[PDB]
DNA sequence: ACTAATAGATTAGAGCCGTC
RNA sequence: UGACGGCUCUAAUCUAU
């Protein structure tokens, strides 16, 4: 390198404004208050927050969800006699600001169940959409079938690629975290398939 | 958010107060901070433990061009860089033949063969440091590839 | 079966510098696969390659390839990594392995502590208050003997968030002149940002301070001279957060980046982790192979 | 009594892979 | 274990139904 740039090793760095886009997804809107429904016998005491159509979590003697009590009439048709005023409502802005401190539920604790209602919410979406999934070791990747999308590409960029006989699919595994602020921890992963329609075991 | 601070890179000292941020570029021209006059080295290994090291012992003070100097800077040699000498002299080749390494290699118990191959090598080094006079500095245990590829956790 | 850790565990009594070398990595041309090609393309990187096995041999022989000149006086870069002892019967306890950096650039090391009240196999990775005064005072005394006074501050680097049950026991042995700050290095945080134009990752040294306590320092990334980043894809910036104590997070980024160029076993532009803990866990795995060693605050020319 | 609890957000670990 | 990456694949823990 001409005696290592004439034995100087220049910085070779320029100072210009560069815009860098991250891998996160920012928050815009959220429900004004989340509801801690008090079902008691209304919800079977043996089975708790594992089958409801909408994302719901259980805490103490109460069920917490972003929907209303009358929104689970199919899987649990018993909820038509519930009296709605026992449901506990808590505005979200109070939890984030730290002013929410009740013996019923704590502030740092309350920030943990909402992300559960979030991190489990997206998997209900791509099920309705034309997106399939693969169960990763620690997360749940979501990939697109080979040939399901038109002309093998979407927006003139690759989504299914050819590697010899096998194929690869770009799969994202998003998560909900609230450390800097409410964000969607969208991560860039990739998984392969044996022939584009069957996965490599 | 719409911000990204760039923090400064510190510079490491070198010979007679030289400050270059990079290590390889600042050492291929300016030399190490401290001076030692020679490397007293020893080689312990199989029959090829010397010869492969021997072909490489003199191959480091001899310059070898890099494919791309910008990414991988040139190196002129051990003597031209480290202000010292690294050659084949004063070496004490311990003869751990493949037959003695093999009677310890082919052991059913993994915990025994990792201990046995340690004791067979460790004792031969401390003895040279105890019942001998050769002042050693760095010991180059040339473990055969058949060992670390098989005797692996 | 990692007898290389067993190699240098039984040599600590005699303190013999050693360098485990391989026929495969020294005769790469001789070693080929079944398809007529070498198993490891090796001599195309014959730059830093010969540097590493020489500068380490230089280091194992007592050489000093470089130093540090941008370090304050009265500052210790403590870095401790807890290592499981599964080599023994149970991992119910986990040994720690810390180290210390001086103002003189002499990166030392010392054996850490064992987890006595270690909650089950893998607890929160924290030393007990009864032995909390052991590690810090030993590190402070090690600095005290060669400087004459306790340091103005210590930066306890770790991959584990510290808790109050050990920091309260830290205080009564720390003089008030020591700013006992604790900086947790966590690569697990999945921050990632790109470049809209160009197939190059972002420059190493970029940082994003989220709040007055935490930050994200890109110790690995694109470089100003080598023109090729020290990575393939965009890496996770190292999450630096002042766990306890008051300090300037901007000034902290001086220290984290500074302890990445110096790695006295390799010749690379920088390290993706602070060597105050990259070197610290370089003794934990060796010292966990055998538990019958009482070792002093040794140097790195033996491990 | 705990019997276990499903999840946050953490931890060390072994793996092969590339090492323009 | 040249040495630097990087995630994969596993495993474990405390804070609360």
């Amino acid at each position: 390198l001409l005696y290592q740039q004439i034995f100087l090793h220049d910085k070779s760095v320029i100072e210009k404004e560069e815009i860098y886009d991250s891998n996160w997804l920012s928050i815009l809107s959220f429900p004004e208050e989340l509801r801690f429904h008090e079902y008691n016998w209304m919800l079977p005491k043996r089975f708790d927050v594992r089958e409801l159509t909408f994302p719901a979590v259980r805490y103490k003697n109460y069920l917490c969800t972003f929907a209303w009590a009358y929104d689970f009439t199919y899987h649990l048709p018993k909820t038509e006699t519930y009296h709605k005023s026992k449901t506990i409502r808590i505005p979200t802005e109070e939890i984030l600001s730290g002013s929410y401190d009740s013996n019923f539920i704590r502030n740092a604790e309350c920030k943990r169940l909402i992300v559960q209602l979030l991190n489990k919410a997206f998997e209900l979406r791509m099920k309705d959409k034309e997106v399939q999934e693969y169960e990763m070791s620690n997360k749940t990747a979501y990939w697109l079938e080979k040939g399901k999308l038109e002309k093998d590409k979407f927006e003139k960029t690759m989504l299914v690629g050819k590697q010899k006989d096998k194929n690869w699919h770009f799969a994202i595994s998003g998560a909900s975290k609230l450390y800097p602020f409410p964000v969607l921890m969208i991560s860039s992963h990739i998984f392969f398939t044996a022939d584009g329609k069957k996965l490599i075991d | 958010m719409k911000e990204l601070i760039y923090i400064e890179e510190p510079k490491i000292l070198f010979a007679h107060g030289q400050k270059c941020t990079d290590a390889r570029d600042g050492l291929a021209l300016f030399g190490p901070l401290n001076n030692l006059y020679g490397i007293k080295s020893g080689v312990i290994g199989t029959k090829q433990g010397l010869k492969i090291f021997r072909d490489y012992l003199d191959h480091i003070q001899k310059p070898i061009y890099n494919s791309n100097s910008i990414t991988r800077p040139m190196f002129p040699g051990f003597e031209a860089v480290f202000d010292c000498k690294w050659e084949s002299t004063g070496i004490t080749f311990k003869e751990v033949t493949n037959e003695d390494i093999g009677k310890f290699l082919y052991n059913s118990s993994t915990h025994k063969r990792t201990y046995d191959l340690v004791s067979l090598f460790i004792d031969k080094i401390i003895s040279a440091n105890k019942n001998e006079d050769e002042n050693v500095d760095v010991w180059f245990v040339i473990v055969p590839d058949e060992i670390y590829k098989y005797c692996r956790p | 079966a990692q007898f290389h850790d067993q190699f240098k565990a039984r040599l600590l009594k005699h303190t013999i510098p050693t360098q485990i070398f391989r026929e495969s990595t020294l005769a790469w041309r001789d070693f080929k696969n079944a398809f007529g090609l070498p198993i490891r393309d090796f001599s195309k990187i014959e730059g830093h390659l010969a540097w590493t096995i020489s500068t380490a041999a230089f280091y194992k022989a007592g050489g000093k390839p470089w130093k540090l000149s941008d370090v304050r006086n009265g500052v210790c870069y403590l870095g401790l990594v807890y290592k499981k002892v599964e080599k023994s019967k149970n991992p119910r306890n986990a040994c720690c392995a810390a180290q210390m950096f001086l103002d003189n650039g002499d990166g030392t090391v010392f054996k850490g502590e064992v987890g006595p009240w270690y909650n089950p196999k893998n607890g929160q990775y924290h030393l007990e208050p009864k032995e909390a005064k052991a590690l810090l005072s030993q590190s402070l005394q090690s600095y005290k003997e060669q400087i004459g006074e306790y340091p103005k501050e210590v930066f306890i680097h770790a991959k584990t968030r510290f808790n109050h049950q050990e920091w309260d026991a830290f205080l009564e042995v720390t003089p008030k002149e020591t700013n006992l700050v604790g900086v947790t290095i966590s690569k697990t945080k999945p921050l990632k940002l790109y470049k809209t134009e160009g197939d190059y990752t972002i420059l190493r040294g970029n940082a994003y301070v989220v709040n007055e306590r935490s930050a994200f320092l890109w110790t690995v990334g694109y470089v100003p001279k080598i023109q090729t980043a020290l990575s393939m894809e965009v890496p996770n910036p190292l999450f630096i957060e002042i766990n306890k104590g008051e300090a300037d997070i901007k000034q902290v980024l001086k220290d984290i980046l500074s302890l990445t160029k110096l790695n006295y076993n390799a010749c690379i532009f920088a390290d993706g982790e602070p060597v105050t803990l990259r070197f610290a866990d370089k003794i934990g795995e060796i010292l966990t192979a055998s538990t019958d060693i009482k070792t002093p605050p040794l140097a790195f020319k033996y491990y």
Side-chain angles (χ1 to χ4, degrees), chain A residues 12-201, chain B, chain C residues 1-83 85-120 123-303:
Chain A
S12 308
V13 69
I14 196 54
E15 194 292 338
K16 306 294 159 289
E17 286 321 292
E18 262 281 4
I19 317 301
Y20 291 165
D21 39 2
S22 161
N23 79 302
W24 298 357
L25 301 181
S26 151
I27 211 79
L28 315 203
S29 87
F30 52 93
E32 48 268 1
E33 40 96 349
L34 56 143
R35 342 193 98 87
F36 264 85
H37 310 275
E38 182 194 350
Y39 292 130
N40 303 338
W41 149 65
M42 262 311 88
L43 157 83
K45 207 252 148 177
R46 206 52 208 79
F47 220 124
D48 314 71
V49 297
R50 291 303 272 174
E51 212 190 330
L52 304 108
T53 36
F54 285 177
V57 304
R58 185 201 151 200
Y59 174 77
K60 217 139 106 171
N61 314 87
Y62 313 91
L63 187 144
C64 160
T65 199
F66 292 141
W68 250 122
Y70 46 87
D71 301 341
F72 321 119
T73 202
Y74 168 66
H75 72 67
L76 189 48
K78 211 213 298 173
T79 66
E80 87 287 349
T81 88
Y82 178 48
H83 151 268
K84 321 290 179 192
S85 153
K86 334 163 207 301
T87 281
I88 322 171
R89 288 159 223 81
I90 168 58
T92 315
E93 59 92 24
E94 185 178 15
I95 309 139
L96 310 182
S97 70
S99 37
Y100 189 31
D101 215 310
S102 172
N103 307 358
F104 158 72
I105 196 171
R106 285 318 191 194
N107 191 101
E109 305 237 341
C110 189
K111 284 212 228 194
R112 152 159 64 226
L113 319 89
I114 50 186
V115 313
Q116 176 40 290
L117 305 143
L118 295 176
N119 57 38
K120 89 173 293 285
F122 332 102
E123 297 75 9
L124 290 186
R125 288 306 310 127
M126 298 71 89
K127 268 158 175 302
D128 222 327
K129 295 286 276 279
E130 43 259 52
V131 186
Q132 325 90 50
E133 93 192 331
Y134 152 75
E135 183 66 38
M136 261 199 228
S137 284
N138 262 1
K139 310 153 90 157
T140 304
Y142 268 88
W143 52 285
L144 175 63
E145 199 70 272
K146 179 218 167 323
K148 148 165 299 303
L149 82 161
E150 78 312 327
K151 53 103 170 169
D152 207 54
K153 304 222 181 313
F154 147 76
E155 204 259 342
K156 284 63 61 183
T157 183
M158 71 285 308
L159 274 311
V160 53
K162 195 219 83 147
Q163 304 294 339
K164 318 173 138 204
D165 60 334
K166 92 198 62 162
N167 281 344
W168 65 265
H169 318 325
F170 189 90
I172 51 161
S173 284
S176 50
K177 300 220 194 284
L178 319 184
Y179 148 66
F181 64 105
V183 300
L184 185 34
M185 209 27 51
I186 290 285
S187 283
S188 64
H189 307 280
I190 168 180
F191 209 64
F192 283 61
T193 42
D195 67 305
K197 307 197 266 282
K198 204 260 163 165
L199 272 84
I200 326 168
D201 212 346
Chain B
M1 182 145 58
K2 191 70 74 151
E3 83 158 71
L4 206 42
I5 189 188
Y6 190 77
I7 196 57
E8 212 172 4
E9 321 190 4
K11 298 233 186 199
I12 45 188
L13 213 73
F14 280 90
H16 28 65
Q18 296 210 47
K19 274 148 184 172
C20 169
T21 278
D22 193 3
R24 311 198 269 149
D25 266 313
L27 211 57
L29 326 172
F30 306 145
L33 178 76
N34 206 10
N35 162 246
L36 51 70
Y37 317 96
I39 306 283
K40 266 171 298 313
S41 89
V43 170
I44 172 174
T46 190
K47 153 76 204 52
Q48 277 53 248
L50 276 194
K51 185 40 69 197
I52 283 304
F53 196 91
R54 291 296 100 149
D55 177 39
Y56 216 62
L57 190 40
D58 62 341
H59 200 69
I60 274 168
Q61 53 269 63
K62 148 78 179 153
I64 288 103
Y65 86 111
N66 272 285
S67 204
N68 170 266
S69 194
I70 296 103
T71 44
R72 328 293 155 194
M74 211 75 168
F75 83 121
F78 198 107
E79 176 143 60
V81 170
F82 288 84
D83 69 89
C84 159
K85 314 152 171 163
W86 197 58
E87 66 289 349
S88 88
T89 181
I91 329 302
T92 325
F93 176 44
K94 314 265 151 191
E95 194 51 90
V96 277
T97 49
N98 253 333
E99 71 84 20
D100 68 75
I101 211 78
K103 294 332 171 283
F104 284 30
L105 196 183
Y106 271 119
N107 193 272
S108 45
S109 156
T110 316
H111 193 285
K112 291 313 288 321
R113 77 175 168 169
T114 178
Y115 205 79
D116 286 16
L117 293 172
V118 154
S119 272
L120 158 83
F121 275 10
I122 295 316
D123 67 348
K124 291 191 41 159
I125 303 321
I126 180 46
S127 85
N129 282 67
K130 276 195 143 69
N131 73 346
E132 216 150 305
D133 50 3
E134 271 186 64
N135 183 94
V136 86
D137 262 338
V138 181
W139 257 112
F140 292 77
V141 178
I142 325 289
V143 192
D145 64 289
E146 271 59 48
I147 295 304
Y148 91 83
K149 89 176 172 16
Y150 194 10
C151 284
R152 210 187 38 159
Chain C
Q2 180 70 16
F3 62 123
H4 312 195
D5 303 354
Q6 277 192 73
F7 254 53
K8 285 135 174 179
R10 289 165 110 205
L11 291 169
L12 284 205
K13 149 78 212 61
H14 333 296
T15 80
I16 290 135
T18 326
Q19 269 255 49
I20 289 103
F21 276 35
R22 303 61 59 180
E23 271 77 349
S24 181
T25 82
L26 268 61
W28 80 258
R29 159 201 62 258
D30 192 273
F31 287 90
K32 81 203 264 294
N33 79 330
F35 299 137
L37 60 140
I39 41 156
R40 34 169 79 233
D41 189 282
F42 214 81
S43 272
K44 299 292 302 311
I45 73 181
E46 204 36 271
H48 73 307
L49 210 180
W51 283 88
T52 50
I53 48 184
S54 72
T55 202
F58 199 62
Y59 192 59
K60 300 302 221 180
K64 279 85 157 188
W66 49 70
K67 214 189 86 137
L68 248 176
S69 64
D70 313 308
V71 292
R72 276 165 301 185
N73 85 22
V75 48
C76 313
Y77 302 127
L78 265 164
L80 80 179
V81 163
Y82 290 82
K83 296 300 267 173
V85 314
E86 208 261 341
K87 274 68 63 192
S88 50
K89 201 60 66 183
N90 48 52
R92 187 240 71 78
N93 48 353
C95 307
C96 201
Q99 81 188 87
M100 243 190 65
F101 279 18
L102 315 172
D103 180 40
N104 295 103
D106 174 34
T108 65
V109 80
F110 37 93
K111 174 65 198 167
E113 312 301 324
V114 280
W117 180 32
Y118 208 41
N119 197 199
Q124 203 62 85
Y125 295 90
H126 286 320
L127 91 166
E128 324 317 314
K130 90 94 189 168
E131 65 158 42
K133 318 155 193 42
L135 180 64
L136 191 142
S137 85
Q138 144 172 351
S139 177
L140 253 61
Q141 164 159 327
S142 96
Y143 189 93
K144 167 93 163 53
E145 52 87 20
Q146 76 110 12
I147 295 294
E149 280 78 28
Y150 295 109
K152 330 302 307 183
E153 90 268 27
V154 304
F155 277 60
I156 310 112
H157 292 39
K159 220 171 302 315
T160 293
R161 332 299 180 81
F162 296 113
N163 50 7
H164 185 288
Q165 57 94 41
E166 81 209 331
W167 220 277
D168 68 328
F170 275 154
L171 278 191
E172 69 270 32
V173 312
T174 55
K176 76 215 76 47
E177 290 80 11
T178 85
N179 270 336
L180 181 70
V181 309
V183 168
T184 283
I185 323 298
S186 95
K187 145 180 177 190
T188 176
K189 214 70 41 60
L191 179 41
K192 144 182 314 178
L193 58 96
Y194 285 108
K195 293 196 43 185
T196 81
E197 327 322 332
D199 58 272
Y200 313 130
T201 46
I202 83 161
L203 316 191
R204 184 222 183 229
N206 275 298
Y208 166 47
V209 159
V210 190
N211 39 5
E212 75 279 355
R213 246 62 157 163
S214 149
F216 286 78
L217 186 52
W218 294 68
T219 57
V220 50
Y222 215 71
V223 301
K225 20 187 153 187
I226 289 151
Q227 73 84 0
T228 296
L230 325 160
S231 154
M232 171 295 268
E233 103 289 0
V234 53
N236 314 275
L238 272 300
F239 166 83
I240 284 76
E241 177 268 334
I242 301 150
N243 173 272
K244 173 61 194 80
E246 46 99 25
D248 169 43
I249 195 61
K250 294 252 181 63
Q251 143 269 309
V252 163
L253 304 186
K254 278 327 111 162
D255 314 328
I256 308 280
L257 226 44
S258 86
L259 327 181
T260 52
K261 319 296 254 217
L262 75 78
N263 187 3
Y264 295 124
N265 227 307
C267 273
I268 316 289
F269 197 18
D271 192 303
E273 282 84 6
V275 293
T276 184
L277 50 97
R278 157 73 59 79
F279 270 145
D281 85 317
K282 266 190 226 188
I283 82 161
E285 84 294 32
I286 279 149
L287 281 162
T288 44
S290 167
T291 80
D292 313 328
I293 312 113
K294 187 283 179 185
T295 191
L298 295 204
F300 301 75
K301 42 198 165 170
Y302 306 141
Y303 311 113

